[PDB]
Design a binder for this molecule. Structure first.
Ligand code: AKG
Ligand code: AKG
Ligand code: MN
Ligand code: MN
Lengths: 317, 318
């Protein structure tokens, strides 16, 4: 009886938190820094308040920035075998139909990827060097001397070294579905550009989540794609909504969230804070590197956990 | 419907678990000690941003006050100075008493008389405490400013701002500061004696009770008795009725699922009391203390605490 009234009160506060939080803590545009910050300034101004920014002139020390290019990769590591994600439509690790679709895993010489990117050669579907798991040192070690194993002022600020360094090189059709990571992320564009769409963690009440049975694409011999359910896998929660084409009929509440878009260009470094929902688009053959630092699990993390569970518990998700 | 009653219980269940879940990750079992002042970066990353307390030793060695300051030294130095003194019948200024938020009687007495009371050479009705705050050290006792620093340099650099106020504290052992929290980063410097702190983290809010009280002020009558005059001009004030020293578990049973964190801060030591932390304060007789208030950043942790506070009310736990 009366409990229903208490439930709507709780729901109203959860619905009001995302607006309150952004007016106080979320920028109106992802800000630019004229130069790398000091470790103290970085932690106080961006890391602790959990706020994104793009740092200019932070890679001028990197040999890679003057050297890296599709022709340079061909000459330098063309024969190196790399892991390449293949999908029919360019959405790896994304909800397609009623399944969480995982990429097809293929080993291919880098040279081939470069030909496909340049339109020199074809392949069914969409290619993306996107292995992660610190794929830069793991698969293209010969490129390590062309960059720093870490961002010194950022590593000093956080008091720890990165847990992984990943290399990203994909087709323009290769889109990363909206998701969040429990890492502090420094995303460095060496060539081309990346188009980032953001939601802050405090938008959680309006970001829909559902459980999907996991599946993987299997690439046939006939040049088509099959779906192989991962029968021996626990189910995985994921965000079904496309921020670029949101289904406001199924999840009207996403309109009450507010996305923050931005583009990061070659030579620029983006600080993407921990737990921020992000969706990523790239230019054809974009070359990028990102540094992952495990986040600190403190009051901000415990608070988000409460927000995430209460979003579900209150029936907003 | 029947689902609504079940949904509300799932919410309340998560809220009641949050304080224990949060403290396992974020709240220490005991207040840690530091052997020397930290660097600005270390101070921000280890204590401020994670929002957790510590006591810093050997941080006041540059303060002449640490060698000079004492009850006798003050008498010679500022004994004739008139200062605002809080007076209450029982030693509890800014505390819930019955159906009113009781504010102390503020009187302007020369400091020479306060020292007499503390040393037992003289007597006064009720309990004396110099706690006016509002930066009462530069405002009322400017002669003492040379004996210390106008701010804490390594802390000011870390927080990127200057202190919003510097307060002088001196009171009887019977004068207790009720449990409350501030919207400030607080650096509490004990110059002489000792202060005993009892803490609750912000995340204990689900079980920390709050009520709205009519404000009233004590009035000392010429006969040495205390009258209660209500403050009609102020709107109702929210305050914590509960006494961590004698908890009324019959009235507020839910405090038992909270967990207090106690510690003592001695002369020469500096406590970092993080913003929004609930704290309750006792002092030895004539304890001498100074504290720096830096305004907190109103960031995501503030919004999160505001949400937790609001949810505590919407859900019926408070
Ligand atoms: O670059 C991408 O496509 C994804 C990047 C990402 O997911 C991350 O850095 O956390
Ligand atoms: O010194 C006391 O008794 C209380 C001080 C206090 O409330 C504070 O430092 O914020
Ligand atoms: Mn990511
Ligand atoms: Mn206080």
């Amino acid at each position: 009886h009366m409990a229903e009234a208490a439930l709507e009160a709780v729901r109203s506060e959860l619905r009001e938190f995302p607006a309150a939080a952004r007016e106080l803590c979320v920028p109106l545009a992802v800000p630019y820094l004229d130069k790398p910050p000091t470790p103290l300034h970085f932690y106080r101004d961006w890391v602790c308040p959990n706020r994104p920014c793009i740092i200019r002139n932070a890679l001028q020390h990197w040999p890679a920035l003057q050297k890296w290019s599709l022709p340079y990769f061909r000459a330098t590591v063309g024969s190196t075998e790399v892991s390449v994600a293949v999908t029919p439509d360019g959405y790896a690790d994304a909800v397609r139909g009623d399944r969480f679709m995982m990429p097809a895993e293929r080993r291919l010489p880098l040279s081939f990827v470069l030909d496909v990117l340049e339109g020199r050669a074809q392949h069914p579907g969409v290619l993306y060097v996107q292995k992660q798991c610190s794929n830069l040192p793991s698969e293209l070690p010969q490129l390590l001397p062309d960059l720093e194993s870490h961002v010194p002022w950022a590593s000093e600020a956080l008091g720890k070294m990165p847990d992984a360094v990943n290399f990203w090189l994909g087709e323009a059709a290769a889109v990363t579905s909206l998701h969040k990571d429990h890492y502090e992320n420094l995303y460095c564009v060496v060539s081309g550009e990346k188009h980032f769409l953001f939601h802050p963690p405090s938008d959680r009440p309006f970001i829909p989540y559902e459980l999907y049975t996991p599946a993987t694409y299997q690439l046939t011999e006939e040049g088509t794609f099959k779906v192989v359910d991962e029968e021996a896998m626990e189910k995985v929660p994921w965000i079904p909504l496309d921020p670029l084409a949101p289904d406001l009929a199924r999840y009207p509440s996403y309109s009450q969230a507010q996305a923050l878009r931005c583009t990061v260009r070659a030579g620029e470094m983006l600080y993407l804070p921990a737990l921020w929902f992000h969706h990523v688009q790239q230019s054809q053959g974009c070359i990028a590197v990102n540094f992952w630092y495990d986040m600190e699990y403190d009051l901000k993390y415990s608070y988000f956990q409460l927000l995430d569970s209460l979003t579900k518990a209150s029936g907003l998700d």
